[PDB]
Design a protein around this ligand. Structure first.
Ligand SMILES: CC(C)=CCC/C(C)=C/CC/C(C)=C/CC/C(C)=C\CC/C(C)=C\CC/C(C)=C\CC/C(C)=C\CC/C(C)=C\COP(=O)(O)OP(=O)(O)O
Length: 240
């Protein structure tokens, strides 16, 4: 339970935030300070009981406050969770109400504590790449299977985009739970659990763009029309 250096609520909110009655957002960060390799923002519409997930491309070309335009992934490296949150709020012009940061070990242990998570594997290409990645320690099979933590970790690490695999497994973890550092108390986290596990819909949205490589460093330049569309959708979802 770590607090952000920004106050009791997101500076982006114009009105007082009521955690238990308002729509809210959660930023999930996965780490191997370090760069963030999983960057998933989830917005929860309370009245509609819906969630929308968005993966921010790790190489997305964005302004990092205090550091200029750079890969999104570097925000956490330069200034930890606080700077990553600032970077997201500026990029999407929405509040990031909660943030959750997890490393490999926490992820694997969570999956194992849940007795694995269900994934429907569909690609021989992905299976072969994971075999290579893991020197054959992880051998997935096509079809619907329950993956242990080692297997799930390999699946979300291999480089369907990686961001999409991350969102897939994140939603699977939630489904299995029906059956690490953050900025809200465990009591509040647990208070949100019934809502989070009784959603009427779960959707994903995607930031599109193109490879931008001005001088031997790869960035992903965001399509600005799609970015504006995404911003409006998330702002509407949060009721801001
Ligand atoms: C699905 C949905 C609607 C909501 C789920 C998220 C929400 C809202 C949670 C609400 C708050 C709450 C109660 C949380 C309780 C905890 C809980 C149930 C889940 C916590 C989430 C969790 C365990 C992890 C979140 C992050 C995720 C999805 C995956 C972590 C992956 C990870 C640790 C690391 C990934 C690192 C990756 C992908 C690559 C690094 O590999 P590399 O550097 O060798 O290779 P490269 O550099 O060449 O690429």
């Amino acid at each position: 339970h770590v607090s952000l250096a920004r106050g009791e609520q997101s500076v982006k909110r114009i009105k007082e935030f009521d955690p238990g009655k308002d729509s809210f957002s959660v930023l999930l960060l996965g780490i191997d300070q370090a760069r963030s390799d999983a960057n998933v923002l989830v917005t929860f519409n309370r009245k509609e009981k819906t969630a929308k997930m968005l993966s921010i491309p790790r190489d997305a070309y964005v302004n990092i406050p205090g550091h200029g335009y750079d890969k999104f992934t570097h925000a956490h490296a330069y200034g930890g969770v606080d700077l990553t949150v600032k970077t997201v709020e500026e990029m999407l012009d929405i509040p990031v109400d909660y943030v959750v940061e997890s490393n490999f070990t926490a992820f694997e242990d969570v999956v194992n504590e849940l007795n694995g998570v269900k994934v429907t594997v569909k690609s021989d290409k992905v299976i072969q790449q994971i075999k290579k990645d893991t020197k054959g320690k992880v051998v997935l099979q096509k079809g619907t299977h329950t993956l242990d933590g080692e297997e799930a970790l390999a699946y979300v690490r291999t480089r369907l985009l990686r961001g999409q695999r991350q969102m897939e497994v994140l939603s699977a973890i939630i489904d299995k739970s029906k059956s690490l550092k953050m900025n809200l108390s465990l009591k509040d986290a647990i208070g949100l659990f019934p809502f989070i596990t009784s959603l009427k819909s779960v959707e994903s949205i995607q930031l599109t763009g193109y490879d931008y490589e001005p001088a031997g460093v790869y960035y992903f330049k965001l399509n600005q029309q799609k970015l504006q569309e995404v911003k409006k959708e998330l702002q509407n979802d949060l009721g801001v």
